[PDB]
Write a protein that binds this DNA or RNA. Sequence first.
RNA 1: AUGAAAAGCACUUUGAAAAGAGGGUUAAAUAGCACCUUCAAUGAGAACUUGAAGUUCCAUGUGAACAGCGGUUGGACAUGGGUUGCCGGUUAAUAUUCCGGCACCCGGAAGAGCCCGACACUUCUGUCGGGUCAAGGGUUGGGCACGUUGGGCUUUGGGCGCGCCCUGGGAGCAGAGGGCCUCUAGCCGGGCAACCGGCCGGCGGCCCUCAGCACCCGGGGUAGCCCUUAGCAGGCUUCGGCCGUCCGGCGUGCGGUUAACAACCAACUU
RNA 2: AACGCAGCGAAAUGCGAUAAGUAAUGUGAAUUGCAGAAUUCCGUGAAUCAUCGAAUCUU
Lengths: 121, 385, 134, 76, 122, 153
Amino acid sequence: KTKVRKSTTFHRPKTLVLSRAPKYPRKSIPHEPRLDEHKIIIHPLNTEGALKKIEEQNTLVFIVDVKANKAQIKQALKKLYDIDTVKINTLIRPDGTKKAFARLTPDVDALDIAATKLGLV
Amino acid sequence: KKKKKKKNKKKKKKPTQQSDPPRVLISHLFPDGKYPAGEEVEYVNENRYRTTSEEKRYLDNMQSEFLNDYRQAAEVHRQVRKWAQGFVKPGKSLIEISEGIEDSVRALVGHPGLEEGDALKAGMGFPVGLSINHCAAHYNPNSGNKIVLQQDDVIKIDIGVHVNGRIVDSAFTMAWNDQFNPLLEAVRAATNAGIREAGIDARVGEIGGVIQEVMESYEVEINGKTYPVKPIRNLNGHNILPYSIHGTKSVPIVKTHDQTKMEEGDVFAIETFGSTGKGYVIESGEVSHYALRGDAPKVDLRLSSAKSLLNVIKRHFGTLPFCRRFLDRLGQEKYLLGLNNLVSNGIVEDYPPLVDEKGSYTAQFEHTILIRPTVKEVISRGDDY
Amino acid sequence: MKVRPTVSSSRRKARKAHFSAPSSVRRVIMSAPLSKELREKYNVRSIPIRKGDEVQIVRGAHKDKEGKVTSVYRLKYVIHVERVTREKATGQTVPIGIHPSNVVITKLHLDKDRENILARIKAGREQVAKAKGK
Amino acid sequence: PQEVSDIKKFIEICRRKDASSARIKKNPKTQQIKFKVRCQRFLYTLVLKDSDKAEKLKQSLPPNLQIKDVPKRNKR
Amino acid sequence: NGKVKAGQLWSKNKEELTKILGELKTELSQLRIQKISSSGAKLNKIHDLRKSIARVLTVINAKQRAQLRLFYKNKKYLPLDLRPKLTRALRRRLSKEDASRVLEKTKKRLTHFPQRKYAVKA
Amino acid sequence: VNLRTQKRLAASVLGCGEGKVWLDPNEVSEISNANSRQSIRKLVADGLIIKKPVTMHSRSRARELNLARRIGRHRGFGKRKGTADARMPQQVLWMRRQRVLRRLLVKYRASGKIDKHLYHELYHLAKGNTFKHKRALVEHIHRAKAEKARERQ
RNA sequence: AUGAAAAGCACUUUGAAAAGAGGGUUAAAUAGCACCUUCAAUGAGAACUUGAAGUUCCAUGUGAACAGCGGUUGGACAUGGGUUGCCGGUUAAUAUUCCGGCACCCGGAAGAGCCCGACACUUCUGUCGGGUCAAGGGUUGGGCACGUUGGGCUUUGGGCGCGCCCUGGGAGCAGAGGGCCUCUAGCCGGGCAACCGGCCGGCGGCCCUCAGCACCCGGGGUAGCCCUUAGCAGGCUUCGGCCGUCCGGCGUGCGGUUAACAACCAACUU
RNA sequence: AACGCAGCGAAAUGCGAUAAGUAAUGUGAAUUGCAGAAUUCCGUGAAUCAUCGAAUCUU
């Protein structure tokens, strides 16, 4: 009078899982997007090495937040300076901050960008 | 013998008068090649014998060329300062004043200052000074400046001209509100007092001490409140050397025990500063003035931008002070990075504007004096100051 | 003698509260007596001193010296009036700090709030008088 | 680096859209002319001996392709 | 330009508050670039700009919080941050009505035999 | 004048050690302000910085002794310090002889000088230390073939 | 725990400096914030600095302390900077991480690096030439005939040239001589001057004649390459014929007895 | 507990990317080592002042 069972092992029956439908938000409003472009980029670096990079390798050396990754650095420079980058190489300095070398696209000249974008003027 | 064509070539009369703005070569206005002497004053007291000494007169004649071209430089200064005294008014822009001054100087000396070597033969000895209100010195508008002088501005006009590295540096102040007028007389007296006190064997601390009695003996009424005139202690006059505006000896404007003597053959800049404030100025504001140091560190520059710019400065300006616009007119495009690197290294000192406290008013007058073997020559004296 | 329980008559606590008093409290401590002309004009015996009013010195080596206060320097419990200076070795003049209790206020700095302060002190003094004179 | 042995294949390799640049290398000590074209993935080299055949090839490939002569002592 | 007064901020809509916040952040960026090697009057503005941004953010935040409390009026379950916070103990404490409840029998005793206002002579 | 930095920089650019760098004593002033690889490199071109040649170390005497040994001049008993096996192992002497004998037998079989039956017999004879060297093996082969030829009956 | 108040020491002078002596502030300073060798260079000073000869990392500075002697030196002090699947390069300090190339016998690749040179070069900057391939062992050579494969080379025949040299046009450029007119400078006569006449320098735009370099268009000849036929590009002779005196290999009788012989190449070991 | 934040700070104190703090209320001219502001009070109001009912609150 009961359904046949091809196996001697009993398995827990499948029951539906209802999605959460809270009657009140546990947090009233979502947080503002943390670590936006102004928080990411702090200030360019004016040092002999950093300026040497600008003239020769067409790269700009920036000091960014230590908790930002290369994807955020690339987006920050594009939406704040309208400068494109072929690649970005980042290191964390012994003082605890992040140094980001941003090589610009060959179409633009970095030295001009430093003047126009007030990097050094 | 070949009889070739000889079309009539009308001898043009040399011009005898100047234009507005000045563009006539100075040699056209002095066809005999002799330029006016400045104000001649005998030395005082135990030095009066110097006037008639036969040996010193011949010694002076050995440097006749030094004397006569400098006299040319001083005469150019007088005509340019006359134009400036007639032109500057509330409502004039600093940019157009500076361009007019440089063009007049360059036209009169015959040196456009574009070709290599040309600025080192003759022309501006240092960037013009256009210092407003609390700025005492070393302000110059850079390219694109839009500032216009207003009724309540106090403007200092400091003009330097050199010929063959002999630089005439003289400066004066203008104001248009009569409450500001007394300041000019106070500083004028100290400059004129310096002229009376200057001479061979005079001790510089006495000049500084005399300046102190005169400045605190003057007062000025401004907006219902009275301020004594104070010397700006931390400014000083100086000796002049070939192609170098500042030498190693100073003539203070406060008392000292300094036993440095003025000597035969020297040239001195007698400058005075007055202030209603504390009597000392600090550096503040956007920097426009620069000068290559004579005691320049011979660092092996690491930046190629710097490697060029430095040579360009030496070739075009040498040790004479320059300004940014003097670079723009050479065609260097973007060059600040090399310039700022050179400043940071310390090869080329940047001269920022110098200001006393906010709300104060300062005045400035300056003359160059030549310490000739017989008498003192206040070569830059004119009817204005 | 002290009666109210909240009042403390301990030297150590009084010295601590005075020397470590904040800026707002130090203004009340640094009070000066009014001149007899202003005392009879405003019916006020003393006021918290302010930068901007002339002052006469009655105690010290600078007695009978009149001048306006240039700085109310609360950290050191001193004020600086004009023309009281001391030359350093260099000859530079430094202002001399005078305690507000050794001076008298001959002229006031007249502001909109000082009118309220003077009105509050005046109204209180005669108001007390009517209650005590009953 | 790969070689193109046949001439005909070399032009087609120079004709495909990802051929950024090309160059001619001269070896006078052996009379070898090396035609190298750079594509997206590989650098293809074709070694030639007869200079007579070399001149025909240079004007046969599409003109859009930039060709250089590989000067001695290429500056850094 | 100058320091932004908190008084005028309170009378601005949200979208105008957002626009001014962007300008303030942008100005702080380039002004923080120039800080390298320079001492003087330049610095005072970046300190003021930092505090100016803070004032705008609080105004945006405060006006947002006020709107939420208006929407969640007459609502059984409020968000955790909008709910009153006193202490853990005070929130678990019995409600005023619950702690003051009485039984039927206790209510009957108090209705008929409460504490009387009596005086005894001498 | 402190030129320690210049000496280190010169060695790196010159691609040599620091003990080979020569700095002109009479131009210590121009070397003093080099303070960079480019300037050090410039002083190399101008002849101010020179790399000293390596110290002479010649194998001429080693070559002379080796030649004298090839003719037997320094091979005496007093010139040997190890055992004969260390100097010349028997295992490599045996391995040399075995390959020499086996190689000789292989080409003889291919050329038809011997058949497989004589080749097999000689192969195990060689493995059994019967022939001292190559000459012994051929001498044995010649004698055996003559006797095999001799049986014409 | 200085002093009521920093008024905490101006200025002169000795000393490399630290500091000292005057002088000044204070009521008081008997209250002073301690209340291996030689030479040379650098430097006040050189045994232990440098050259030549025999976060400690990097640069610049440096009073004390430390470096159990000294110290100009330093892993010390002060202030700045430095850490981003192969080859080459790049920095004062990072590189398989940066830059360039290229990826996941020949191409890469000689264009790279390394040696030699020549001229320039204050520095911004190097440029161009040349090279950079007594015993103990091996490897070859097996022939004569025939047939077959590469044909190594050459002759004839066929196809494709333009390397050079001869002839026509042009393009761009360089220099010497003559003509047109414009700007600046020196000498003579005259002229109050202005201005009028003669000689001379720099001109200096344009036109005509002479010499040299590089580029394009159109007509002639090769001198190189590729393909076939014949010989192997051959020598001797009866002049018929014979040898294949070309190289290389592969297949069938051999012969294998003196290859047990020659030549060539090689280390070592009693 | 860790890490950051000041015009010039290493520690302490204070604060949390709104960082030597913000808002709001009170009071009513300062802070102080050098810098640097504000009312110019009729709204607009220093300071590390007091109060503090609104917020931010990094790992």
